[PDB]
Amino acid sequence: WSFDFIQSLSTQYKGELYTSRLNKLEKDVKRILVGEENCLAQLELIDTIQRLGLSYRFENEIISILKEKFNYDLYATALQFRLLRQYGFEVPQEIFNNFKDEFKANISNDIMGALGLYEASFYGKKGESILDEARIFTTKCLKNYIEKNDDDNNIIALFVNHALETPLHWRINRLEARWFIEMYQKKKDMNFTLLEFAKLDFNMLQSIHQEDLKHLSRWWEQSKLGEDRLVEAFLWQIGVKFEPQFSQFRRISARLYVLITVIDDIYDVYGTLEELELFTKAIERWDVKAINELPEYMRMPFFFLFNTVNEMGYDTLTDKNFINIEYLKKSWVVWSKYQLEEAKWFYSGYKPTLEEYMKNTWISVGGPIILLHAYFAFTNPLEKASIKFLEYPTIFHLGSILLRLEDDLGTSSDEMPKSIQCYMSDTGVSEDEAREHIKFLIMETWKEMNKEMDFNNYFSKEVVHVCKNLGRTAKFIYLKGHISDLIINPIPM
């Protein structure tokens, strides 16, 4: 994973011949989708296409088809429910009373219906007890089917394992796309043109991602802050905003993921309280003349953060005629203040309750910084709503809290007090039980975020995507093969 390794990343799936073929396949698959008269087969086609990762190329077509579905068995009712819930349509949670007497026992015999219900249950908003009942009962059903039944050629078991590992609603698009492209060839029903379009689009998107990663790699190399978690930060852009036209975002946002990651280490690892006070006060002053005051090893990271954030502010001034450097500076100020508070906790030995830890850490996790950059990237700030707003977003709180809880559930073994240990302090439980409670808190935050709709909110749909994908990518990252799957090697066409 050296610098020359990343710069040597290349692939054939780029150019005008491939782009013409991609548009050909795009229109072919578009007419295949719009042409299917069978309502249920059309819903299954929608699900197949979106699991191939191509949902970003048929948004309006899929929404128009689903404005036609506004008899079915459990798998079909669950698929329709999930696809309607996904695109902002209102279908009641109580459409599953048709499958109860609690839930019907024969659903255990209906393995595919149980899997569809499991997938649909994770779209449950807060207060939808029927969908949580479905979640629990279907998790039981699927674990039972897995225990009941080494075969490389058994699709039902592989799908059940994949869903138990992480449901559709929580998995990032690129990982699910690669896995389902691999799986779709094992179907006896598969469409060859659909698979060809999936492969080609995934490969061209992988080429765009390779170029973005090489860009970020050159940027971090000329930082000379390695003479080093670069690709870990770009995996975040693969999980957050994978679509092509968001190249620049991926190239710039990743820097935040780098910078945060670096400066956290200055706080949680290398910094005495005097030097951390100096660093935080230099960020608060935010002046290129405050660099003499910092110790020698702190000048370079602070100077680089200064230049990078000012470059982002200039990007906003040049793309949207707006001066947001004040707000980026303020976000880094608040982040640095809460990081310094955590450093004081570490030195003084403070072990807070879970309440204090949760009130604190969702800000110092880096969430608000990334989300403010995304806001200024996908929101017109010359509008009235923006100018009024800048004087806190619930969706940002939920996204940053999902980020924090996933980070802690991933890094508690390697790096350990965090959330699990604070809960072990408050209530007296073993680490297993506290990890389970943190998982429950994650699921509660998810079902609360399912209320914030995607496509028509106070914020742009891209910002809602960035928040929910912050959550999903946090779940994915902390959870070498598949990094190479997504970034390095194309799908063999």
Added chain:
Amino acid sequence: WSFDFIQSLSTQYKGELYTSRLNKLEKDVKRILVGEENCLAQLELIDTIQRLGLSYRFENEIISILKEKFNYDLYATALQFRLLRQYGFEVPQEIFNNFKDEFKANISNDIMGALGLYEASFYGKKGESILDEARIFTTKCLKNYIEKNDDDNNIIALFVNHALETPLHWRINRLEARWFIEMYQKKKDMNFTLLEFAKLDFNMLQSIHQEDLKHLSRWWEQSKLGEDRLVEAFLWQIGVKFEPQFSQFRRISARLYVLITVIDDIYDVYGTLEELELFTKAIERWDVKAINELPEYMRMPFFFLFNTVNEMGYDTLTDKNFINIEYLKKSWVVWSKYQLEEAKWFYSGYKPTLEEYMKNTWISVGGPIILLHAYFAFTNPLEKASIKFLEYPTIFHLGSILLRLEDDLGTSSDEMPKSIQCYMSDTGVSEDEAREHIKFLIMETWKEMNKEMDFNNYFSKEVVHVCKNLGRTAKFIYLKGHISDLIINPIPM
């Protein structure tokens, strides 16, 4: 000359096969040079090699050979004198009394000796009256030979015209290299291996220059300050520091040449005194929070200048562990102050004497900024001489004054009070006579700068090169074909 035009610049003379061939030819030509026993033929070989532009690959070999020349006719005495003066050797100006009775009249009959003497005369330091006599008499001789004798096949006349246009000591290396590579094939004495090495090295250097220009082009494109004299600024790097290993310098210094060029236009063209006061005071404050104060059209250029200069300061901090942002800020402060003084002169209608204009304009021409960046690029600032020095360099004064006088002599027709017109104000002369006086001032500044030695000075030899090449490139730029000669099309191998 669009952005996609520059990004589409490509050439084959890049890679490892060509690099291996280049090293083969380099060692072959090196042993050809060291092997020639004939002292006079060896001096002629040195001159041929250096006029091919390859002097940057045989510096130590040439200096060691010239430590062997420490009988001859006029051409040989002049060539030896010029080559000894070029590399810092001390040869008296009075070695040409052997060719006097004033100078010998038969020198008019000795056309090649007259040309060699003309070329050697421009190495005359201040106070060497013999060399100025040689300059005048040889200019007369060569103009007479040109008037006395449409043939495409006459080498003596073409060489005399080329020298009259600009002597060797004043012409940039790349232009002379291209022209002499074209001319060397017309010789009956030519060495084929030498010509092949010249062609190959020039083409690989042109490839490196193409890449540097594409880098600068992308940088200026993402500035969005064009949605535009970019290649004009990179011609400056082609003239200032052409050697390969100075890629980064060429990529960064050019930005100055851009930024200055832009901000001068904000002063000399678009700015009222209120807005210019605001701009200069915002530069003096040098804070990202001073951007609200500037009018809308000034925020973007000031913000971009801020980010770029801070990036240069970070480059210094990362490559040489030194905080020089104070000095870059101070250089831009002084430049902005003198530009605002000139704007006050324009509005109030002030027409200064040549004395005031010369005391002022060599600073506002941009010279000191470029030269300070070059200083921090090619000088170790952790040394005692640097730390003591930063508390004004004569070589910078001379380079910036050559820059100013060449700029004015070039742009007086298109853009017109400057130096010529101020001299017309003080002394009552027509514009022709004042242009001639400005040319004389340029030659006086050159013969004063010939005292500042190249290879062992208070400053690094690269800084001395940057200053003298500032002068030469100023003479060249203001003086579409040859831009394409140097940048776009290789020499047909």
